[PDB]
């Protein structure tokens with residue numbers, strides 16, 4: 001430490017036929033990618049989306065994560081996680097902070113980008129498909145402690161913290177354009193995604209096949225259910241339990257030969273599974289919204 005947390009993006013619009021946005025900032029006279037520090041209570045994806053909008057005028061849908069860049073600054077170390085971000089429209093107007101934005105194909109953007117780490121990010125971007133759909137696998141938020149009773153406490157609810165995580169997850173799941181909601185047949189799973197359900201005004205599909213008991217009883221039915229959900233149109237959120245997620249994630253990653261750059265399994269965490277034509281092309285583990 002001290003680590004100053006930030007996030008940014010390769011903002012793109014219509015493989016390597018797309019155009020990407022490169023910005024110019026007067027204060028530093030640099031050509032780079034949009035990025036900015038996280039505000040109080042923001043996560044990286046929420047900050048990336050916000051900074052794309054504030055600097056370029058565009059709204060966007062985040063997809064694949066593109067790695068991390070660190071460099072020293074007087075306060076310590078700046079850390080920047082980057083996402084591919086598909087433009088959903090907007091218009092750039094110059095300001096004091098960013099006076100120019102150019103939309104360039106990857107090759108010319110490579111030439112325009114002055115920092116080696118930005119070119120490294122853009123190399124990662126072109127490495128895989130960027131027109132992806134997304135499956136968000138979420139482990140439910142904190143819900144106190146398991147009781148002494150055998151098995152699972154079906155009705156045990158989120159605790160105060162878990163409720164806050166559920167609220168903070170709305171903005172992070174919307175940053176990836178979540179559209180449809182699923183939770184394992186436990187109260188704490190449904191409660192984690194209820195604030196998002198309110199915000200989209202949508203129903204949560206119940207998933208008894210994805211509880212810990214059912215995964216332990218019939219792991220192949222769970223796996224098959226996950227792929228059925230993934231196959232539906234739209235970007236599903238699936239909220240389940242700690243003994244389920246690692247095994248489903250490691251199975252999908254191993255069969256699609258996809259390497260996660262980070263890994264964890266914390267309550268309130270999210271896995272961002274990027275799909276192109278049904279093949280897994282990214283698996284990005286995001287910390288709980290109130291952890292680093």
Ligand SMILES: Nc1nc2c([nH]c(=O)n2[C@@H]2O[C@H](COP(=O)(O)OP(=O)(O)O)[C@@H](O)[C@H]2O)c(=O)[nH]1
Pocket residue numbers: 028030032033035036037069071073078115117118
């Ligand atoms: N945007 C960007 N700036 C970088 C990088 N590396 C790097 O050393 N810098 C420099 O870091 C300094 C601080 O820039 P930064 O954008 O991190 O600061 P701020 O959040 O705008 O205050 C500037 O002089 C940049 O030229 C980089 O990869 N991207």
Ligand SMILES: Nc1nc2c([nH]c(=O)n2[C@@H]2O[C@H](COP(=O)(O)O)[C@@H](O)[C@H]2O)c(=O)[nH]1
Pocket residue numbers: 029030031111112113114115
């Ligand atoms: N504006 C600017 N451009 C720089 C710098 N360094 C640096 O390598 N370049 C590159 O110089 C080219 C553009 O110069 P201008 O048109 O003068 O902004 C781009 O290739 C940038 O990547 C720099 O500090 N300022």
Ligand SMILES: [Mg+2]
Pocket residue numbers: 034035036037051
């Ligand atoms: Mg910035």
